[PDB]
């Protein structure tokens, strides 16, 4: 009894969970259109030449 | 027999009860 009756300890335990996120992005795109004689040229991005 | 063990969660503790040879082969462990 006196073993199974004795103080046993009190803790108190901090957790901290932390959580960072970044981002970027960076866009660019030149999209013309030449009409010269006879000829007609068009440059995009998502059709080429 | 085998000795018989005693657990105590709260304390952490370990009890073994048996015959004085039974005893000091968990005493070794």
Redesign the interface.
Known sequence: VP??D?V?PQINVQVRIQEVNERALQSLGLNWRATFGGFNVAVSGGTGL | QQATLIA?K??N?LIVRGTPEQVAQVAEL
Do not use: E
């Open positions: 073993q199974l004795q046993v | 105590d709260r304390t503790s």
